[PDB]
Amino acid sequence: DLADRFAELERRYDARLGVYVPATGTTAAIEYRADERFAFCSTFKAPLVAAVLHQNPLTHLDKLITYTSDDIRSISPVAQQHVQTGMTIGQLCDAAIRYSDGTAANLLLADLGGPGGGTAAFTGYLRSLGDTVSRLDAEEPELNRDPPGDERDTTTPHAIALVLQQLVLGNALPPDKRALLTDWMARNTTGAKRIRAGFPADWKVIDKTGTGDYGRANDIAVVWSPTGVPYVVAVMSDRAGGGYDAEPREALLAEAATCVAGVLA
Template sequence: MKKFWVNKWLAGFVITMLSGCGMNQDDLAVDQLKEPSHIETEGTLDQQFKQLEKDFDARLGVYALETGTGMTIRYRDDERFAYASTFKALAVGAVLVQSPTEELDKRITYTSNDLISHSPITKEHVENGMTIRELCDAAVRYSDNTAANLLLKELGGPEGFAKVLKQIGDDVTNPVRMELELNEATPGDIRDTSTPKALANSLQAFTLGEVLPADKRFILTNWMKENTTGDELIRAGAPTGWVVGDKTGAGSFGTRNDIAVVWPPDRAPIVIAILSSRDTKDAKANDALIAKAAKIVLDSLGKTM
C-alpha cells in the first residue's frame, strides 16, 4: 500500500522555531535539509491518487519531500517509470559536477547530421557551435534533444552519466540510451527508467545538497525556474506565490513526467517528482494529471507547514 508519511510533532516544532528566528528563504537551504520522517498516518491521499489514475486511465507515481521537516508524500514511489526528458536536469547537474566553472565556456561544435527532432536552440547554432553553458541552458529550459545528447557525450555517454549518479548515491536510475530512443518507454523495459523517489533524491542532491558548490547550484536552479516547458504541469498545481523550478518529460505509452524544486514563501523548499504512464503505445499523455497530482501534494504539505 502507498503511504502518506508525516511527523506532526516535528513539523510543529520546526515551524515554531523558524517563525521565532525570522529565517529567510536563503537560510532554508542546505543546512535545513532533514532526514525523511518515518511515522505513518492514515489519510485520504492514497484514495485521491487512485481516483486520478482511474479518471485519467493512467499509472501515477509520486514522491515529495518537504526538506525543512522531513515530511514525505509517497505513492508508487519505488515503482519504475521511463524518465524521458526529466533526465536532462540531472545530466546537467552531472556536467556541472565534472566541469570547472571556467570550462562551462568551452565551445562544442557539431554538424547538421547531429541534429534530431525537437532541437529548437541547437538548430540555430550549427555554424558556430555552442558553449557547454549554452547547451545546459538549452537542455533544461527548452528540453533541446541535441543539446542533451552533446552533454551526454561530454559525460562519456549514458555510462558516464550513470557513474556520476552512482557517486551521489543513485543506483536506481538506469541511463542506457540517448535521445530519442530513451523515450520508447516500453512497459517492463528498465532501460532509461527510474523511480519517483530516486529522481527526487538525485534532484535534491544537485540543487539543494552539497554535491555542487553554491554558485553552481544557483545556476542550475535558475535554469529550472526559467524552464519554458512546465507551465501546465507542477507549476499549474502550485499555490499562488510559490516558485517552481522544474524539468518535464514525455514519451510513448502516455508517459508524462515532471520533477521540480518548489519554494513556498519563507519556508524550506519541497522536492517533488510526479511520473505517469498508460497502457498503449500511442496513448496520449495529459498535463492535467500531473497538475492535479501536484495540487494534492502541495496543498497537503502546505497545510502542515
C-alpha cells in the same frame, strides 16, 4: 486517505501515477508508487548538466562545440539555429534545461565521454550520489521509446527526488555551480501546465519536464512555501494501456500537484 485520491485520479485518465515528496522536519513523506520504475524521458537533462559542472571548471563552459545537420535527431528548438555557428558548452546547458533541447542533451553526454556515448559515465554519476536504481542506456530519442516493463532508461519517483534534493538543497555541488543549475531550472519554459499549474502563485516553483511515448509525462520540481520552506516534488505518469500512440495528459500532473499542496499547507 491521500492514497485514495491518487488512485481516483488514476481512474479518471486511464493512467498510472507515481508521486514522492521527501520527508522534512515537520512533514511526513508522501508516497504513491514511489518505488515503481518509470521512464526518465527528459528528466535526466537536469542531473546531466550537474555532472558536467561536477567534473569541469567554470572555464570549461566557454568551449565551442561544432555539429552538423545529421546530429539533429529529436526536438531541438535551439540547436537547429546554430548548425553553422556552433554552440558553447555553456549555451548547451542553458538550452538543455530551459528548452528541453534533445540535441544539446546528446552532445553533453559526449562531453562526459566513455562507452555508449556517455550513458555509462552518467549512470556512474548517479551511483556516486547514492542512486543505485536509476540507469540511462540510450540517447535521444530512443530513450523515450522503451516498451513498458523494460528497465532501460528508467528511474523511480523515490530515487530521482532524493537525487534532486542533493543538487539543489544539498552539497552535491559547490555554491558557484549550484547557482547556475537553480537559475536555469527557474527560467524553464516547458512546465507551465504541470506542477506549476497546481500550486498557488505565491509558491515559487522550479522544475524540469519529461514526455515520451505510451502517454509518458513527468515533472520534477523544488518548491518554496510563501514563508520560505522548501520541498521536493516528483510526479511521473504513463498510459501504457493505450499502446505506443497514447497521448500524455498534462492535466493529471497538475491535479496531483494540487493534492500535494493541500497536505503541505
